[PDB]
Amino acid sequence: SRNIFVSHRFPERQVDLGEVVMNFAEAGSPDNPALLLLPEQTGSWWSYEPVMGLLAENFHVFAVDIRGQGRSTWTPRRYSLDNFGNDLVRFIALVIKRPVVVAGNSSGGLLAAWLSAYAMPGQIRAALCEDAPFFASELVPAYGHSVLQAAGPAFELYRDFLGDQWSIGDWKGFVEAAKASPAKAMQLFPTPDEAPQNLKEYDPEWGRAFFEGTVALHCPHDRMLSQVKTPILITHHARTIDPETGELLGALSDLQAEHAQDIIRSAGVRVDYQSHPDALHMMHLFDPARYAEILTSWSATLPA
Amino acid sequence: IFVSHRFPERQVDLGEVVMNFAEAGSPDNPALLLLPEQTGSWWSYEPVMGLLAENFHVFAVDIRGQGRSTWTPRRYSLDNFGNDLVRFIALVIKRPVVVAGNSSGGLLAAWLSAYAMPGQIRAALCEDAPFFASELVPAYGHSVLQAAGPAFELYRDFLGDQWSIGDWKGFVEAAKASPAKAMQLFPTPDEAPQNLKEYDPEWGRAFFEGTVALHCPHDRMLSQVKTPILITHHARTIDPETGELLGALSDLQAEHAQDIIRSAGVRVDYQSHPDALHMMHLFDPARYAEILTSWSATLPANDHHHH
């Protein structure tokens, strides 16, 4: 329907980028440094709603709905990291019109790195990659677990039961397949009787693109990390190896994080790594005060 | 390996790609962005630019993976090509443009009409563009495997991504031996020509393997165009034995392309030039210049873009 939205504590506006009309919320005062917040997959801008007040003390915050999510345009067959990233390049150029710190969670953290490497010159001051699945979200990664061995199971179910643009919509089937899944990474997957608000706002073709290896086909992660041009902060939250299946539970393994750091270091840019092994994947949502402190303290070490 | 040209060249950093280009004419005339064919550098337009600079502010570009522009391993997609050009318009031209492209560049002219930033594109000239026929899974008619694919396969197999194999002699041998009717007229000089020395053959891999437009199905892209389109349709024939398409697109593919654009509610003009060579802008430059100039003069705001 694309008519299922609810109210939020910050006003929302939309901007025509040329193909996507991007929805976003704004917080904070425009005399403060600009901060672009990129949600996790299945998450709308309001994934950041609880933390935006804290960040508004110090930043001019723009939290966006990425294409295929929230009130931003759904674009069948066009889901790629490059299209996600170029939408954001346009958003910075058309809306923000200043250099930004960009912070993103999970797939959004992939896009924060993408911008550090591939944005227009001067657009990106620095990038915060909050529990980003470097390598582990690729179909054939250079290192470690692939998407099939990590976050893939839920993506397969989104595709098979919800379908591209919610064209199947079989939430009841999805829940019963999620409960029956032998993937240990599905063990704590929430299975409410009714689809949650964030999933109702989510184009499940996103999940297809991740599961099928098309989203990053043209953006191998080893190459993209070698092309970053700004300081990078990597936060690395909970992760474990399942002792029955060998699945990666979490965003990326220790080995994948080591390689991501090594590649960035070899590009000659500043890289900082923080391991928070008892934090949840979406620390900006489940521990806003800790996330805000991490981001604010690191941002204060960046050159003006 | 570059050679001299009669228009000075400049480079601009788009962020990932540093784009090389040649500029001619006065900014008092409408801005015109010229996009070469695959394997062609900006100077595919060098013989015709003098004619066009009489009436346009001309920018002829090296697309990523070609000429002096950055080669970008594993990143060759219509979207990445097109977004470079969005950035070029925003950073260099800073005015709305008429965009004219040959072959793959014509695909990218249509791409810009659909997907550029608001207001950047006034109109698109698609000069013998392989709509559908350059897809691996086209909505209509021949796939690339039954059209331009044979040469692309040989580029991949003998020249290699970023010229990493570089077996020009084996390439020529295989071209001569090809069973494809579409290779019958392919030039096989003893040394690689300048345009191909400037070409990253991963371009050919991306077309042959169906990765270049995986995320840009042509039926959907044509349905999203937002500006007037001029389609020129040069020589084409279907081989009666192999069914190969010799040419850029078939009559059936051109019919559907027009129909989809018309259904988008935009102006579309179609000119069939059945005896014209694929690169008319290079091999019949006076004719191409008249087509482009006469058509541009019919566009709304032609007067707004003279100063």
Numbering used by the authors:
A (entry chain B): 23 to 326
B (entry chain A): 26 to 332
What's the publication's text?
Zearalenone (ZEN) is a mycoestrogenic polyketide produced by Fusarium graminearum and other phytopathogenic members of the genus Fusarium. Furthermore, we report site-directed mutagenesis as well as structural analysis of the dimeric ZenARe of R. erythropolis and the more thermostable, tetrameric ZenAScfl of Streptomyces coelicoflavus with and without bound ligands.
For ZenARe, the calculated molar mass of the 6xHis-tagged subunit is 37.103 g/mol (assuming cleavage of the N-terminal fMet), and the observed molar mass of 71 kDa indicated the presence of a dimer. Crystals of space group C 2 2 21 with 2 subunits in the asymmetric unit and 46% solvent content, yielded a dataset of 1.46 Å resolution. The structures of ZenARe and ZenAScfl were found to be very similar, with a RMSD of 0.43 Å (over 502 equiv Cα atoms), with the catalytic triad and oxyanion hole residues superimposing almost perfectly. Most differences between the structures are related to the cap domains. Similar to ZenAScfl, ZenARe shows mostly negative electrostatic surface potential, especially at the active site. While ZenARe has a similar dimeric interface, composed of 30 residues over an interface area of 1195 Å2 (ΔG = −9.4 kcal mol–1, KD = 0.13 μM at 25 °C, according to Prodigy), six amino acids are different in the region corresponding to the tetramer forming interfaces between subunits A/C of ZenAScfl and five amino acids are different in the interface region between the subunits A/D. These differences lead to the abrogation of tetramer stabilizing interactions and corroborate the SEC-MALS result, which showed that ZenARe is a dimer in solution. The catalytic triad of ZenARe was therefore defined as Ser-128 – His-303 – Asp-153.
